[PDB]
């Protein structure tokens, strides 16, 4: 059941990996993976009904 | 001898697993798996000798 993932190596001394085994039945007991996703800011930065083209007049 | 099972993940951050190894000879020493089965309530809720059809008269 071992999970093996790569570290993003900052200061250096191939790919370095690290190993994770979950010891408990409840996902709540688990550490945080920090394997997270980014998303586009659009829902807050561009919430307009008509798609904005930045080279064009915002008002036409 | 490692047993690998899936967790039912509640709050999220594929399938997450967890690992179990029994360290002792006596099954009594083991943790609880919590891998349990449900059953129908019938033996307490419907203990009648003749099968009940709910749309029909219970007495006929």
């Amino acid at each position: 059941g071992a999970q093996v993932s790569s570290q993003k190596v900052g200061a250096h001394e191939s790919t370095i990996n690290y190993t994770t085994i979950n010891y408990y039945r409840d996902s709540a007991s688990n550490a945080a993976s920090k394997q997270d996703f980014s998303q586009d800011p659009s829902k807050f930065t561009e919430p307009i009904k008509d798609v904005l083209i930045k080279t064009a007049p915002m008002l036409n | 001898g490692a047993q690998v099972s899936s967790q039912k993940v509640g709050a999220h951050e594929s399938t997450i697993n967890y690992t179990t190894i029994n360290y002792y000879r006596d099954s009594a020493s083991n943790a609880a798996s919590k891998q349990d089965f449900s059953q129908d309530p019938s033996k307490f809720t419907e203990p009648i000798k003749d099968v009940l059809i709910k749309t029909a008269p219970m007495l006929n």
């Binding site: 059941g1 999970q3 093996v4 790569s6 | 690998v4």
Partner: peptide, 5 residues
């Protein structure tokens, strides 16, 4: 056994 990410 192993999962590799």
């Amino acid at each position: 056994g192993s999962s590799s990410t």
